[PDB]
Short mmCIF file of C-alpha atoms (C1' of nucleotides) in Angstrom, two decimals:
data_model
loop_
_atom_site.label_atom_id
_atom_site.label_comp_id
_atom_site.label_asym_id
_atom_site.label_seq_id
_atom_site.Cartn_x
_atom_site.Cartn_y
_atom_site.Cartn_z
CA UNK A 1 5.43 -22.99 26.62
CA UNK A 2 9.04 -21.89 27.05
CA UNK A 3 9.08 -20.53 23.50
CA UNK A 4 5.88 -18.60 24.18
CA UNK A 5 7.42 -17.14 27.33
CA UNK A 6 10.52 -16.12 25.39
CA UNK A 7 8.37 -14.45 22.74
CA UNK A 8 6.47 -12.55 25.43
CA UNK A 9 9.74 -11.41 26.99
CA UNK A 10 10.98 -10.22 23.60
CA UNK A 11 7.75 -8.29 23.06
CA UNK A 12 8.12 -6.66 26.47
CA UNK A 13 11.70 -5.68 25.66
CA UNK A 14 11.01 -5.01 21.95
CA UNK A 15 14.16 -7.02 20.99
CA UNK A 16 13.82 -8.63 17.55
CA UNK A 17 15.89 -11.02 15.40
CA UNK A 18 17.47 -9.58 12.20
CA UNK A 19 15.47 -11.21 9.38
CA UNK A 20 15.81 -8.46 6.67
CA UNK A 21 15.50 -4.66 7.00
CA UNK A 22 13.96 -4.01 3.55
CA UNK A 23 10.18 -4.57 3.16
CA UNK A 24 9.17 -7.83 1.46
CA UNK A 25 7.09 -7.81 -1.70
CA UNK A 26 3.90 -9.65 -0.77
CA UNK A 27 0.21 -10.11 -1.63
CA UNK A 28 -0.34 -7.04 0.58
CA UNK A 29 2.08 -4.77 -1.31
CA UNK A 30 1.84 -6.30 -4.80
CA UNK A 31 -0.07 -3.23 -6.01
CA UNK A 32 2.98 -1.12 -5.02
CA UNK A 33 4.93 -2.64 -7.98
CA UNK A 34 2.86 -0.83 -10.60
CA UNK A 35 3.20 2.81 -9.48
CA UNK A 36 5.26 5.31 -11.55
CA UNK A 37 8.58 4.38 -9.83
CA UNK A 38 10.96 2.38 -12.06
CA UNK A 39 11.60 -1.24 -11.03
CA UNK A 40 13.51 -4.38 -12.01
CA UNK A 41 12.83 -8.00 -11.11
CA UNK A 42 15.95 -10.20 -10.97
CA UNK A 43 16.12 -14.01 -11.16
CA UNK A 44 19.27 -16.09 -10.51
CA UNK A 45 17.42 -19.45 -10.57
CA UNK A 46 18.57 -20.22 -14.14
CA UNK A 47 22.31 -19.32 -13.92
CA UNK A 48 23.88 -22.79 -13.43
CA UNK A 49 21.60 -25.34 -15.10
CA UNK A 50 22.23 -29.09 -14.96
CA UNK A 51 21.25 -31.17 -17.86
CA UNK A 52 19.83 -34.38 -16.45
CA UNK A 53 17.52 -34.73 -19.46
CA UNK A 54 14.16 -36.28 -18.52
CA UNK A 55 11.20 -37.08 -20.82
CA UNK A 56 7.57 -37.87 -19.80
CA UNK A 57 8.84 -41.33 -18.70
CA UNK A 58 12.08 -40.02 -17.14
CA UNK A 59 15.04 -41.68 -18.90
CA UNK A 60 18.51 -40.70 -17.63
CA UNK A 61 21.01 -38.61 -19.66
CA UNK A 62 23.71 -36.27 -18.24
CA UNK A 63 24.94 -32.87 -19.59
CA UNK A 64 25.53 -29.25 -18.29
CA UNK A 65 23.90 -26.41 -20.32
CA UNK A 66 24.14 -22.59 -20.54
CA UNK A 67 22.40 -20.26 -18.10
CA UNK A 68 20.76 -16.85 -17.95
CA UNK A 69 20.07 -13.93 -15.61
CA UNK A 70 16.45 -12.93 -16.16
CA UNK A 71 16.22 -9.21 -15.36
CA UNK A 72 12.76 -7.77 -16.14
CA UNK A 73 11.27 -4.27 -16.14
CA UNK A 74 7.55 -4.81 -15.39
CA UNK A 75 6.58 -1.30 -16.53
CA UNK A 76 8.22 -1.27 -19.96
CA UNK A 77 8.29 -5.04 -20.45
CA UNK A 78 12.01 -5.03 -21.40
CA UNK A 79 14.03 -8.10 -20.46
CA UNK A 80 17.76 -7.65 -20.01
CA UNK A 81 18.59 -11.34 -20.39
CA UNK A 82 22.31 -11.86 -19.70
CA UNK A 83 23.12 -15.32 -21.08
CA UNK A 84 25.77 -16.98 -18.91
CA UNK A 85 27.87 -19.30 -21.08
CA UNK A 86 29.03 -22.70 -19.76
CA UNK A 87 32.73 -21.73 -20.28
CA UNK A 88 32.44 -19.70 -17.03
CA UNK A 89 32.06 -22.85 -14.90
CA UNK A 90 35.07 -24.76 -16.35
CA UNK A 91 37.67 -25.60 -13.68
CA UNK A 92 35.75 -23.86 -10.87
CA UNK A 93 34.67 -25.01 -7.37
CA UNK A 94 32.16 -23.79 -4.76
CA UNK A 95 29.99 -23.19 -7.77
CA UNK A 96 26.64 -22.06 -6.39
CA UNK A 97 28.24 -19.28 -4.35
CA UNK A 98 30.21 -18.12 -7.38
CA UNK A 99 27.03 -18.04 -9.44
CA UNK A 100 25.31 -15.67 -7.01
CA UNK A 101 28.29 -13.32 -7.12
CA UNK A 102 28.33 -13.45 -10.92
CA UNK A 103 24.63 -12.60 -11.01
CA UNK A 104 25.19 -9.66 -8.68
CA UNK A 105 28.03 -8.41 -10.86
CA UNK A 106 25.83 -8.66 -13.95
CA UNK A 107 23.08 -6.71 -12.20
CA UNK A 108 25.56 -4.01 -11.21
CA UNK A 109 26.79 -3.77 -14.79
CA UNK A 110 23.22 -3.44 -16.04
CA UNK A 111 22.56 -0.68 -13.52
CA UNK A 112 25.70 1.15 -14.64
CA UNK A 113 24.61 0.87 -18.27
CA UNK A 114 21.20 2.39 -17.52
CA UNK A 115 21.20 6.22 -17.33
CA UNK A 116 20.21 8.16 -14.17
CA UNK A 117 16.68 8.73 -15.56
CA UNK A 118 16.02 5.11 -16.58
CA UNK A 119 17.72 3.57 -13.48
CA UNK A 120 15.65 1.53 -11.01
CA UNK A 121 14.40 2.55 -7.56
"C1'" A B 1 19.74 3.49 64.53
"C1'" U B 2 14.33 1.51 63.33
"C1'" U B 3 10.50 2.80 59.90
"C1'" U B 4 5.88 5.03 55.51
"C1'" G B 5 6.21 5.83 50.60
"C1'" G B 6 4.57 -1.62 48.52
"C1'" U B 7 -3.37 -2.90 49.21
"C1'" C B 8 -4.30 -6.07 41.88
"C1'" A B 9 -9.01 -4.68 40.00
"C1'" A B 10 -13.76 -7.68 38.68
"C1'" U B 11 -17.28 -11.56 40.40
"C1'" U B 12 -19.51 -14.81 44.26
"C1'" U B 13 -19.50 -13.34 49.91
"C1'" G B 14 -22.03 -13.69 54.58
"C1'" A B 15 -12.84 -15.90 52.48
"C1'" A B 16 -13.45 -18.23 47.96
"C1'" U B 17 -13.21 -17.64 42.49
"C1'" A B 18 -10.95 -15.25 39.59
"C1'" C B 19 -5.11 -13.46 38.04
"C1'" A B 20 -4.25 -7.74 35.16
"C1'" G B 21 -8.96 -7.36 32.27
"C1'" A B 22 -10.72 -8.31 26.99
"C1'" G B 23 -10.74 -6.40 18.36
"C1'" A B 24 -6.10 -6.29 15.36
"C1'" U B 25 -3.44 -5.50 11.11
"C1'" C B 26 -3.23 -4.46 5.37
"C1'" A B 27 -6.20 -2.22 1.37
"C1'" G B 28 -10.07 0.30 -1.78
"C1'" C B 29 -13.69 3.89 -3.08
"C1'" A B 30 -16.70 8.03 -2.46
"C1'" G B 31 -17.22 12.62 -0.37
"C1'" U B 32 -15.17 18.08 1.46
"C1'" U B 33 -12.39 22.45 -0.69
"C1'" C B 34 -9.48 24.73 -4.46
"C1'" C B 35 -7.25 24.38 -9.50
"C1'" C B 36 -6.72 22.84 -14.63
"C1'" C B 37 -8.64 20.68 -18.96
"C1'" U B 38 -12.80 18.78 -21.72
"C1'" G B 39 -18.45 18.31 -23.56
"C1'" C B 40 -23.37 20.16 -22.74
"C1'" A B 41 -26.99 23.61 -20.87
"C1'" U B 42 -28.38 28.35 -19.29
"C1'" A B 43 -27.95 33.58 -19.75
"C1'" A B 44 -25.66 37.45 -21.82
"C1'" G B 45 -22.11 39.26 -25.57
"C1'" G B 46 -19.67 39.16 -29.76
"C1'" A B 47 -17.53 37.28 -34.84
"C1'" U B 48 -18.87 35.11 -39.35
"C1'" G B 49 -21.00 32.31 -43.28
"C1'" A B 50 -24.12 31.02 -46.94
"C1'" A B 51 -27.76 31.76 -55.06
"C1'" C B 52 -31.90 35.34 -55.90
"C1'" C B 53 -35.85 37.50 -56.89
"C1'" G B 54 -39.69 38.03 -53.38
"C1'" U B 55 -44.78 39.73 -50.79
"C1'" U B 56 -50.08 42.58 -51.60
#
RNA sequence: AUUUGGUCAAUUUGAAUACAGAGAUCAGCAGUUCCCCUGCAUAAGGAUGAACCGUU
């Protein structure tokens, strides 16, 4: 009830919590992806992969493999796959955070490489 | 120095019920006009091709 009241108050005032300013890609605006404007999907999910090898049964075996930064142009179908080598992560700490930064850097580099015409919106 | 700018509406009444008052948001497509291209028709108007002789 209290929460509801708070919400109502907010509405009245038109205060809102940050969230994110940019508009989310969604089922609603999925069709927006395939207009003439140039775009690039980026994925940092595969940058620091650890592996714990597991078969159909699930037997244990430890290792830490190479990663990648999947960066895809859905118009042209190009895939600027920056392969992150495992040597990067040797003697490092706060690893996940570092990975994100690395990914960002890579993206920036890619952008720089692309000319003004081919660059993404 | 005092005070007016402060009456919820709606319903049931002969004060009670109500309690602020009753589709939103996102997205297609077609039409309307003008333009451009393309194919066809209609008129008109060209331009040109095609062996070899014809008809009382």
